[PDB]
Design a protein around this nucleic acid. Structure first.
Ligand SMILES: O=P(O)(O)O[C@H]1[C@H](OP(=O)(O)O)[C@H](OP(=O)(O)O)[C@H](OP(=O)(O)O)[C@@H](OP(=O)(O)O)[C@H]1OP(=O)(O)O
Ligand SMILES: [Mg+2]
Ligand SMILES: [Mg+2]
Ligand SMILES: [Mg+2]
Ligand SMILES: [Mg+2]
Ligand SMILES: [Mg+2]
Ligand SMILES: [Mg+2]
Ligand SMILES: [Zn+2]
Ligand SMILES: [Zn+2]
Lengths: 267, 295, 100
RNA sequence: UCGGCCUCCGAACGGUAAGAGCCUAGCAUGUAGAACUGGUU
RNA sequence: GUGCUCGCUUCGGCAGCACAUAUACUAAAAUUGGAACGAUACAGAGAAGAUUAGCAUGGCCCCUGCGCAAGGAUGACACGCUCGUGAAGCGUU
């Protein structure tokens, strides 16, 4: 089903509509995202951190061990901060064209450089290593545009302007990367506002937890297979002593030592 | 380790007539989990509406489980049967219920009674309903029956308290000057009013209820013959005999029109004292307001 | 838990359909009318059917021991399933293969 | 008088313990609630 | 309010009709209680000699993370339970 979320917002009284210039919308979105990141800083009281304006994060002062440990972030926050830095760069290029500081050919060539130099200007690879496929395709499109372009009297000068192919590539990446980002930010918001479930959903038994969980389940099987031939009576069940007997038996088998306790019941 | 109290997600707020208002034609708003409970902190169902015209846009404070526990209003936090504080009702009837003060034990016991009400019928002010039927002993001398709208009256314009409400009458908060902050009646801790511990309104109404001799009587020097003034010839001996027939046998039922005295005397001294405590400016015999004194 | 707002990527909607057994997949409509007994004896019968001057000596005469490869036959001795890994034949092969 | 093939490219965790407490921030409320006094041997 | 009137009757208003229909936590508040943990002092790194890799396990112990991942000192913390004295019950004298 289509399920237009913009119509879902437009049905509500919290969202209205207007007509706006796209440069003003980009300035609004950049100011909004800067305010969101400052608000996320102040939510966790990380006032010894600081965002620049160009979405550059830096500590105000040196950290302690507690401030070192608690300020470790994830991929989603840092990657969307870098994405907001990239959109800030695009909005800045649009603004300095709109003030007439650069030419429109310069704005096209600057968009060409921005789309061809994403990873050389932003830290995509530090938080998601998949994106250099797209950066390789941007480089290949740059070389194809350059070697279709440098054909006659033009050379390797700095004024080549084309941005539609990299625009296509990064926006098809953006519709790819949107719902994983939304789910990661939703889990971030739920851990921020509902708190962290310290117990929560039970952990998987991974590779580092194989032998410990195997011996734990073996010990539980020992308890379930030792509680059941006991008749009525016997206050000294001595299951700790049976565990010591079993551990000594396994250690003596590991040591190839003949293990025998002559005082031990037969089954 | 996976324990929590469940959320009060239900309709039908149990409210006073006073906070309910005077309009039969009521428009209503309901938030599902908008706020939390003011006592047990469960996320409860918020009910916000406008009972009249000069209004606070009143809304519910505590959860429906706490209101089911204490039989008080969800807004006014006073007992629904009489309009009285729960400190007054617990002093009148039974004060052995109480509540734990620590948060973890309070939430655990709240989850226990929430499970109890969820297994129960649903419309019951828990265990002391069987012992709360013995009412109108003294608390109905001062229990409200009128819908009190001066507590539903909206909050004070603090801007015109500072003298700077530029809106004037456009401001929906009250443009009257506030009460005394040094007055202990103005303090009103909400948890104290819930717990029934040292509520100043409850202490003021208890101090007021200590003033009237509605059941003192006994002005006769070891004599069962109590003379009820204010009776006259309207109260005869037959009304006193019918009143004392429930208490046993009437030793002396008479009417004296010279002193306007209904002379009531049961055969038992305890029954005569009970009849005098009933008729000491608190009973009407044959349409005549009786006030017991010496006879 | 009726209140959680954290969503794992293994908690996504996926594999939401349920395939069912067709009549080529031993549907319960034919499980009831089919009797498995004479199927089992016909398949066991099929399995039982398809179960089946100067002269020198000999040049190799200058040795001390003759015909030493006489009773050497593996056959089903390796096929004897010893359920003891100290005496497992695969374990012995493992030790001689992985220990020089 | 004769053909072309071109892997890759970086980040965190893992080290500069943990605990403890006192005054201090940031941030949560914009609330519910004030009832007062009279009859006889 | 605007639109309209077999208007009242002046050409203004009024009268009638028509449609117009119940904004809002309402504060620009007042006050209310918890507070990062920086500072100082406090403080001392598991495995019986030292040097110590670690995975657990526990629950009203939590942090960082998007976690059904991994770290947080292995994140922290998480032993001591075989004879007389009598008692009552029933059986024997
Ligand atoms: O066309 P040019 O002006 O001579 O520069 C391009 C290109 O630079 P620009 O994108 O700024 O134009 C590359 O530089 P970067 O993109 O890495 O910043 C670089 O080489 P690569 O394309 O391999 O990255 C370069 O040098 P070279 O000629 O040695 O390759 C050359 O590339 P072109 O071959 O496409 O001209
Ligand atoms: Mg040691
Ligand atoms: Mg490890
Ligand atoms: Mg760790
Ligand atoms: Mg370790
Ligand atoms: Mg370690
Ligand atoms: Mg730990
Ligand atoms: Zn009420
Ligand atoms: Zn509650």
């Amino acid at each position: 089903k289509k399920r237009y979320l913009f119509r879902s917002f437009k049905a509500t009284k919290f969202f209205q509509s207007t007509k706006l210039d796209w440069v003003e919308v980009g300035l609004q979105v950049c100011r909004q995202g800067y305010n969101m990141l400052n608000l996320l800083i102040h939510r966790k009281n990380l006032n010894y951190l600081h965002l620049d304006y160009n979405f550059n994060l830096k500590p105000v002062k040196t950290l302690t061990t507690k401030e070192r440990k608690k300020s470790r972030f994830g991929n989603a926050f840092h990657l969307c901060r870098e994405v907001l830095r990239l959109t800030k760069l695009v909005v800045d290029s649009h603004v300095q064209y709109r003030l007439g500081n650069v030419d429109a050919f310069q704005l096209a060539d600057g968009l060409q450089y921005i789309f061809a130099h994403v990873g050389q200007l932003t830290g995509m690879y530090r938080y998601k290593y998949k994106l250099m496929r797209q950066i390789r395709m941007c480089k290949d499109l740059k070389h194809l545009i350059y070697y279709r372009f440098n054909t006659g009297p033009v050379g390797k000068g700095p004024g080549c302007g084309f941005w539609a192919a990299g625009w296509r590539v990064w926006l098809f990446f953006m519709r790819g990367i949107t719902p994983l980002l939304e789910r990661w930010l939703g889990n971030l918001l739920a851990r921020q506002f509902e708190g962290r479930h310290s117990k929560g959903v039970a952990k998987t038994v991974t590779k580092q937890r194989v032998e410990s969980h195997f011996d734990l389940e073996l010990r539980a099987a020992v308890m379930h297979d030792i509680l059941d031939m006991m008749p009525e009576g016997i206050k000294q069940n001595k299951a700790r002593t049976i565990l010591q007997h079993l551990s000594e038996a396994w250690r003596c088998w590991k040591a190839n030592i003949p293990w025998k306790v002559p005082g031990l019941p037969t089954p | 380790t996976y324990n929590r109290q469940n959320w009060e997600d239900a309709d039908f707020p149990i409210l006073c007539q006073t906070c309910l208002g005077e309009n039969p034609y009521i428009r209503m708003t309901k938030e599902k989990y908008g706020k939390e409970c003011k006592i047990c902190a469960r996320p409860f169902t918020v009910f916000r509406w406008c009972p009249g015209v000069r209004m606070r846009f009143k809304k519910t404070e505590v959860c429906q489980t706490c209101s089911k526990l204490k039989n008080v209003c969800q807004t006014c936090l006073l007992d629904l049967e009489y309009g009285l504080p729960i400190q007054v009702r617990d002093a009148g009837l039974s004060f052995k219920d109480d509540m734990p003060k620590s948060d973890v034990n309070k939430e655990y016991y709240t989850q226990n009674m929430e499970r109890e009400i969820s297994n129960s019928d649903g419309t019951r002010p828990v265990g002391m309903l069987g012992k709360a039927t013995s009412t109108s002993d003294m608390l109905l001398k001062l229990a409200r029956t009128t819908p009190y709208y001066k507590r539903n009256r909206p909050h004070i314009c603090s801007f015109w308290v500072k003298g700077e409400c530029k809106r004037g009458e456009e401001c929906p908060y009250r443009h009257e000057k506030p009460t005394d902050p040094d007055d202990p009646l103005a303090d009103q801790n909400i948890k104290d009013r819930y717990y029934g511990i040292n509520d100043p309104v409850a202490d003021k109404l208890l101090k007021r209820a200590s003033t009237m001799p509605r059941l003192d009587p006994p002005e006769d020097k070891t004599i069962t013959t109590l003379y009820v003034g204010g009776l006259g010839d309207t109260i005869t001996e037959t009304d006193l005999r019918n009143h004392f027939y429930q208490f046993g046998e009437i030793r002396t039922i008479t009417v004296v029109q010279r002193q306007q005295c209904a002379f009531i005397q049961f055969a038992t001294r305890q029954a005569a004292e009970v009849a005098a405590e009933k008729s000491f400016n608190k009973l009407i015999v044959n349409g005549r307001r009786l006030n017991v004194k010496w006879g | 838990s009726q209140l959680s707002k954290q969503y794992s990527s293994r908690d996504l909607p996926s594999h939401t359909k349920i395939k069912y057994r067709q009549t080529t997949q031993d549907a319960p409509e034919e499980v009831r009318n089919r009797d498995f007994r004479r199927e089992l004896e016909e398949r066991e019968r099929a399995a039982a059917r398809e179960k089946n001057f100067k002269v020198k000596r000999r040049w190799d005469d200058d040795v001390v021991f003759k015909n030493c490869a006489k009773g050497v036959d593996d056959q089903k001795k390796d096929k004897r399933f010893v359920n003891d890994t100290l005496r497992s034949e695969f374990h012995k092969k493992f030790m001689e293969k992985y220990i020089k």
